[PDB]
Design an enzyme around this catalytic site. Structure first.
Site, PDB file in Angstrom:
ATOM      1  N   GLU A   1      -1.079 -10.269   3.069  1.00 39.27           N
ATOM      2  CA  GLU A   1      -1.288 -10.313   4.205  1.00 39.27           C
ATOM      3  C   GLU A   1      -2.108 -10.766   5.584  1.00 39.27           C
ATOM      4  O   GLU A   1      -2.437 -11.784   5.775  1.00 39.27           O
ATOM      5  CB  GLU A   1      -0.673 -10.017   5.870  1.00 39.27           C
ATOM      6  CG  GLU A   1      -0.645  -8.451   5.914  1.00 39.27           C
ATOM      7  CD  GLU A   1      -0.641  -7.342   5.051  1.00 39.27           C
ATOM      8  OE1 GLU A   1      -0.912  -7.504   3.739  1.00 39.27           O
ATOM      9  OE2 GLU A   1      -1.400  -6.101   5.520  1.00 39.27           O
TER      10      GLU A   1
ATOM     11  N   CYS B   1       0.856  -1.330  -0.241  1.00 38.20           N
ATOM     12  CA  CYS B   1       0.074   0.092   0.213  1.00 38.20           C
ATOM     13  C   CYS B   1       0.942   1.577  -0.005  1.00 38.20           C
ATOM     14  O   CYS B   1       1.630   1.617  -1.288  1.00 38.20           O
ATOM     15  CB  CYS B   1      -0.780  -0.214   1.067  1.00 38.20           C
ATOM     16  SG  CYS B   1      -1.457   1.633   1.209  1.00 38.20           S
TER      17      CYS B   1
ATOM     18  N   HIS C   1      -3.478  -5.940   0.777  1.00 37.23           N
ATOM     19  CA  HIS C   1      -2.891  -6.506   2.224  1.00 37.23           C
ATOM     20  C   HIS C   1      -2.799  -8.075   1.717  1.00 37.23           C
ATOM     21  O   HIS C   1      -3.685  -8.552   2.145  1.00 37.23           O
ATOM     22  CB  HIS C   1      -3.520  -5.711   3.147  1.00 37.23           C
ATOM     23  CG  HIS C   1      -3.494  -4.199   3.356  1.00 37.23           C
ATOM     24  ND1 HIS C   1      -2.297  -3.790   3.915  1.00 37.23           N
ATOM     25  CD2 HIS C   1      -3.938  -3.268   2.855  1.00 37.23           C
ATOM     26  CE1 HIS C   1      -2.417  -2.437   4.611  1.00 37.23           C
ATOM     27  NE2 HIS C   1      -3.591  -2.209   3.992  1.00 37.23           N
TER      28      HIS C   1
END
Ligand SMILES: O=P(O)(O)Oc1cc[n+]([C@@H]2O[C@H](COP(=O)(O)OP(=O)(O)OP(=O)(O)O)[C@@H](O)[C@H]2O)c(O)n1
Ligand SMILES: O=P(O)(O)Oc1cc[n+]([C@@H]2O[C@H](COP(=O)(O)OP(=O)(O)OP(=O)(O)O)[C@@H](O)[C@H]2O)c(O)n1
Ligand SMILES: O=P(O)(O)Oc1cc[n+]([C@@H]2O[C@H](COP(=O)(O)OP(=O)(O)OP(=O)(O)O)[C@@H](O)[C@H]2O)c(O)n1
Ligand SMILES: Nc1ncnc2c1ncn2[C@@H]1O[C@H](COP(=O)(O)OP(=O)(O)O)[C@@H](O)[C@H]1O
Ligand SMILES: Nc1ncnc2c1ncn2[C@@H]1O[C@H](COP(=O)(O)OP(=O)(O)O)[C@@H](O)[C@H]1O
Ligand SMILES: Nc1ncnc2c1ncn2[C@@H]1O[C@H](COP(=O)(O)OP(=O)(O)O)[C@@H](O)[C@H]1O
Ligand SMILES: [Mg+2]
Ligand SMILES: [Mg+2]
Ligand SMILES: [Mg+2]
Ligand SMILES: [Mg+2]
Ligand SMILES: [Mg+2]
Ligand SMILES: [Mg+2]
Lengths: 539, 539, 539
Positions: free
Chosen positions: C513, C393, C511
């Protein structure tokens, strides 16, 4: 059938909210009565949060009169309700107090019996209380094992002093589980006249306080001055997470003996029986229906004056009033009690103004009392007027002082009430405090013997002053007969005038009102009410 | 100037949260130290919530060692901190307990001293506690009136047992007003390693619990293992409605004697003085600076074995360890303590493995102790190895038993530890428990006399078994000297070997660690540490 | 057998005491993992006491990073644990908050749906919460009915904000009974270094607070830094009225993935299964044993720098760190994270001092962030030094700004970080906040495509600024490729340098993750860790 399998002893805890004097003890006694009639061996116990090791040190303005057991313990008033409704004699173990528990645990600590642990309010105090609670379940001296133990937790939920007892009850519920422990919570529903509404909020806050210590009530006894609407019971059941079967409306009954009928009508006993899974049979109402006939449908009526200091709007004489009502029931007469202050009877004109309308006078006992000049003045007036008189303990002492002042002993008194009196006709034989049951022998065909119809009796005693034996022959010239004595004759136990001197004037040192039961009236009150009836009819 | 006008006696209450063992008592003692140095007459008191009438019945695993006063009362460990930091002897009145309060009130009730009232937890118990608190304010036997009374409330806020003490403290704040009563609250700030953050929530909950009983803390002592960030102190001050001056970060100091410096650096004493409006002067740090030099900058180091049962990670020997450190301070030596289990020393090989690296051995006293075979084994090993030994109470008893087993008395023991021993060289003279200070006479030029530099001493005693006088002449053949006795010589109070037998091996029945202060070290521990130093230097 | 009869949906409530950040959510996730392995369809939910309608408005210093669902709801961090351990996608219904409940009830009130009743915290708010809790039990879109619902009650027992949620849980226990509702309570056992003792008092007070609202815990998870002694567990069980089977020692494990092993070793899952009477089979440890082999026995090690503002000892990047560790597990390498402050990298010398020892750098996203000059400085240094870089990001935005400053655009910036910049290479396309899953297309044989091994992917997005399309052709002269885009190509989604320019430097706006799981590592972290390993081996 009448014979059932063995089951564990059920514990039923009764607790109070909002205030004291809600009739918590009377409700417990009435439930015990119903369960007894359904055939179960009920036993009862009370826990008192106060620190007095026994109420003997207290003043009757605190919680009413004191009570006495057959093993001679001195106990709270509620043991009297338990006796009167179960018709039983209860052990001194039936009244635990914080004073006893703390003294016991401190003594055990001083002896090292905890093997070096730190003594704490939890576990040690709650363990002692739980032990004393579970001891009631042990088989009696004859092997009869109680089916339900009804324990009354004195005080109010949220009092600092009640915290150990409610914690002990919680631990009992943990040990025995929900199938054996039932919680009954008594709460007040006040009526506010200005807005014309019953308020449930005090009950909600009380139940919340009870939940804040880990107890969930199984049923609510809503004490009120009027029958609670059904919508309010529904609201309470919803707000309190209580089974709608368990909200029991309990309005102020005209007499305490109607309470079993109120509780049965509301099906509290059925709810308890179902919830505890007890074996049961239907209630045989025969005896109590006869009692309630004697209550509500008397043939006549008679007025009796109760003369005392605590008479200023207090239940300091509850046992005496109930024995009076039982005496009325034996004759099927309504007895109406006129509460007369002792101090208005000190002057002869005041005594005449107070007593002139009544048909009999009762002089009950007391302690820390003063102003017996008024009591004796009432005796003097009543004897002149011809009213029957019954004197209990101090009543007998006042009768004897009146007789002393009738024969020459104008300055005579008790050493209690004039330590400098030149004629201590009542004196210490502080001397031995006589407590509990003692045997006595009666004069044959005495008015006392005519009442009891026997020469031998036993009565509960609580006093330490006695008639001074030095004055028997002097005061006998009054006409008074020592018509009953100790078996050795050393102690005067009863006094009376011959019927031709006065139709009935009797005194006793004992408290016969503690042996009376509504279904077994005491002979002396039957006699006294009969004499009062005869006076009313002849006057 | 040194002389100031009269003002009312100020009360400072110290209370604890989250947990015990937060150093609440040490913080109170350090604040007493600072206020003393600022010239105020500080007196101190502790309130113990437990019901034990005194901790003598307890086991040192509960709360550490017991302490003894000069009037002979037996008290909590914290009175020892008060002595060690104020350098004063305190009355037995300095330790109140719930046991004492309840016993007193119950006794007063049995005597009727409340004139028939209902005895309640409020007002009667709280009144007794408030009376016992305000009694500290009365002028002493010489008319010296304390300027500040620091009262430590034991336990934790929210313990059921603390409720009467905190209510009494609240009533004291009501009676005397805020200008006289100050509340100091000690709380824990835990560190959570996985997320690397200090948590203030336990402190918030503790302060809320304190507020729920009507107490608002004036200051917070934030106990932590590391210095609290400033942002957390601001958060705590905001959430707890405490002046940001009153949040005091108190990290774990390397020694307890650094605590006065920590509190002074944070200006706790200044805050207390301002808030209570006390007259003050600056702290004269001369003495305590010298003490802290002796603490932190020693010239040498020595290792001492502490042999006992409670040694398994417990402060059961706090006074002994502090007296050892004070002895080190007199010589400017660091004493390092090796905590050795007694039971590993029962075998000679195990004793050698445990002790072989140390420079001295200490055998402290105890009660409820067992396994002294290991203790005596350590004595035997140490004597053979040449290590110095100091034996306190039971240490002396083990020394005497070792000597008994040195001369022919192989089965000799104490009647406490082998009731069937054929040679009870230690026996009851349960016998009279000797408690408190007693005078004793010493052999001239004894090692004890060489230490004390006098022939007469007084020491605090707590024991009931004694050396059996029947065996003095037998055990003297060991070489042991009864080098100190009671003034009549009837009781053995000290034993030692001559320096040529062993350079220093001494035992005493008394607890000299209860007369030591860090700024006034006790002679015997100075001697023992000097002997250990001599061993280390010569070895 | 694998097929079992129908049974009611069991509710398991997890609550926390003493403090937050005790690993309550992780313990709940681990129990969910065990119960899933035993074959039950577990579903999970969290209740947040705070009033924010969703945590998007919060700052990552409060509770860590935000999370995003597939239906696009924005939820607390703990939903991430639930996903990572159950390997599931959870609905937005899985995060209730006080904000949502109050807004819902107020809206319903404004529409009159309560038919004129007074809206109250009880019943209406607790009814809404209980409805939202029981909604989880309804059959899913495919008819699969969960066997256990594990609900995590956020906050701490005794917080004002938790009162409605704990009351709702209590009412659920009342409605469904004890056979369906299980309470797990997580509590802290602190260690006090000065006295060397674990303290149980905080747990006792927490359990007392829990009992004060009518909840009895079935089991205790004792969080501690060291394994709790058995004697302390016995003391806790005795004091708290908890089954000794239910006190579970839960020391800080070296990695979160060991927690299932700790809980199974303590037999928590067996206790829960027995108590809820669930049908079960033994846990198949095959998969998680392989995972723990990848954890504890890696073949090599690599160091990665995490550059951010919240890196000052906070778990603001937990998902990124876990995705990093999963990437290491795919290669069987230990990844060690060096937490690097962004502001030390603003100067080239400071960046060199911080990063010179690491093998890779990660630039995570954030909001309310400042000082990206340091981030871009770290990018510049890393590119010169040859370290691999992954930018998430804001990491991608910094990469693009670095490229802008590489080709002529020295004053270029985001309109977020310099609203007056003459070259807003990052600009609002406040614009539409892209939230949740969006599809993207990748350049064939791009490094991103080589990692994913596909041309089509979907990723979770949370951002509102975008690459300004006006500067694509200008910044392409840096060598940067827009190797992945939205399907229409309008939005840049991924950027990379060709392998011959730098071996691996990649950024994505999403994202990833939040799609990684320890048993299903995300392609980009596998790629990044492989590149870091190749650097370490070649360097
Ligand atoms: O009667 P029982 O069967 O419940 O037996 C009872 C009733 C009450 N108590 C306790 O005596 C104290 C004052 O009682 P008390 O209700 O009268 O409060 P108070 O201060 O006098 O205010 P109030 O005007 O309402 O009377 C309290 O500690 C009570 O917990 C006990 O031990 N046994
Ligand atoms: O130390 P002081 O100066 O405050 O003096 C103290 C310390 C503690 N107490 C009381 O003893 C009981 C248990 O104490 P206790 O803290 O040890 O709780 P516990 O059950 O053992 O849990 P834990 O593992 O943490 O020890 C409690 O009723 C305390 O109020 C007293 O009267 N004086
Ligand atoms: O993390 P979860 O899983 O439990 O989810 C959580 C944790 C905590 N909370 C609530 O936020 C407020 C402050 O929390 P907080 O513990 O941090 O107190 P504080 O003031 O900051 O003191 P402290 O220094 O200890 O942090 C409180 O109302 C909590 O009840 C919520 O809603 N969800
Ligand atoms: N339900 C009732 N209706 C009418 N009178 C009542 C009722 N309950 C109690 N009383 C009277 O009120 C008085 C107080 O009741 P009591 O049983 O002693 O409650 P407690 O023991 O808790 O103090 C008693 O003398 C009793 O006669
Ligand atoms: N501020 C401190 N730093 C380091 N050690 C400490 C501190 N405070 C206390 N201690 C130690 O921790 C123990 C607990 O202190 P203590 O006096 O017993 O407090 P409490 O009265 O609550 O029991 C003591 O042995 C003391 O030596
Ligand atoms: N039992 C544990 N051992 C080691 N580390 C842990 C443990 N439990 C939690 N953690 C870590 O501590 C942090 C806080 O735990 P968490 O699950 O979020 O509790 P909560 O949701 O109540 O705030 C997590 O990042 C987690 O990785
Ligand atoms: Mg009453
Ligand atoms: Mg009253
Ligand atoms: Mg202590
Ligand atoms: Mg303890
Ligand atoms: Mg959290
Ligand atoms: Mg926080």
């Amino acid at each position: 059938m009448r014979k059932h399998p063995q089951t564990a002893t059920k514990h039923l805890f009764v607790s109070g909210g909002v205030a004291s004097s809600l009739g918590k003890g009377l409700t417990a006694s009435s439930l015990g009565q119903l369960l007894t009639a359904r055939g179960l061996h009920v036993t009862m116990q009370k826990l008192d949060p106060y620190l007095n090791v026994d109420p003997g040190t207290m003043n009757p303005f605190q919680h009413g009169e004191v009570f006495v057991t057959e093993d001679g313990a001195e106990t709270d008033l509620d043991v009297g309700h338990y006796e009167r409704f179960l018709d039983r004699n209860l052990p001194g173990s039936a009244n635990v107090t914080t004073g006893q528990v703390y003294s016991t645990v401190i003594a055990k600590e001083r002896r090292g019996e905890y093997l070096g642990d730190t003594v704490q309010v939890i576990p040690h105090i709650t363990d002692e209380i739980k032990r004393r609670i579970l001891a009631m379940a042990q088989p009696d001296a004859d092997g009869n094992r109680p089916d339900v133990v009804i324990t009354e937790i004195g005080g109010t939920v949220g009092d600092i002093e009640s915290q150990p007892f409610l914690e002990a009850a919680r631990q009992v519920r943990h040990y025995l589980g929900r199938e054996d422990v039932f919680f009954l919570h008594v709460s007040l529903v006040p009526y506010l006249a200005p807005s014309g509404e019953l308020k449930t909020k005090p009950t909600q806050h009380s139940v919340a306080a009870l939940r804040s210590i880990g107890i969930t009530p199984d049923a609510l006894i809503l004490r009120c001055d009027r029958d609670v609407p059904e919508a309010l019971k529904n609201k309470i059941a919803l707000m309190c997470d209580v089974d709608i079967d368990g909200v029991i409306s309990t309005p102020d009954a005209p007499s305490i003996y109607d309470i079993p009928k109120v509780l049965h009508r509301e099906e509290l006993d059925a709810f308890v029986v179902r919830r505890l899974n007890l074996p049961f049979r239907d209630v045989d109402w025969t005896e109590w229906d006869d009692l309630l006939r004697r209550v509500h449908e008397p043939h006549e009526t008679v007025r009796i004056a109760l003369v005392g200091k605590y008479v200023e709007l207090s239940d300091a004489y509850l046992s005496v009033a109930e024995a009076l009502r039982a005496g009325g029931f034996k004759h099927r007469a309504k007895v109406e009690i006129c509460w007369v202050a002792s101090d208005g009877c000190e002057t002869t004109s005041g005594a005449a103004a107070a007593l002139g309308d009544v048909h009999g006078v009762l002089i009950p006992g007391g302690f820390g009392i003063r102003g017996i000049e008024g009591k004796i003045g009432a005796i003097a007036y009543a004897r002149a007027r011809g009213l029957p008189v019954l004197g209990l303990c101090l009543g007998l002492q006042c009768i004897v002082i009146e007789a002393a002042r009738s024969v020459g002993l104008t300055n005579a008194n008790s050493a209690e009430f004039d330590p400098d009196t030149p004629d201590p006709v009542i004196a210490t034989m502080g001397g031995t405090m006589r407590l509990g049951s003692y045997p006595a022998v009666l004069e044959p065909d005495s008015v006392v013997a005519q009442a009891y119809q026997t020469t031998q009796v036993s009565e509960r005693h609580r006093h330490r002053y006695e008639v001074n034996n030095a004055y028997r022959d002097k005061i006998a010239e009054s006409g008074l007969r020592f018509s009953g004595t100790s078996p050795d004759g050393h102690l005067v136990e009863f006094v009376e005038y011959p019927p031709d001197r006065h139709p009935f004037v009797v005194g006793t040192q004992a408290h016969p009102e503690l042996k009376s039961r509504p279904t077994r009236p005491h002979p002396l009150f039957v006699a006294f009410v009969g004499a009062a009836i005869d006076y009313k009819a002849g006057e």
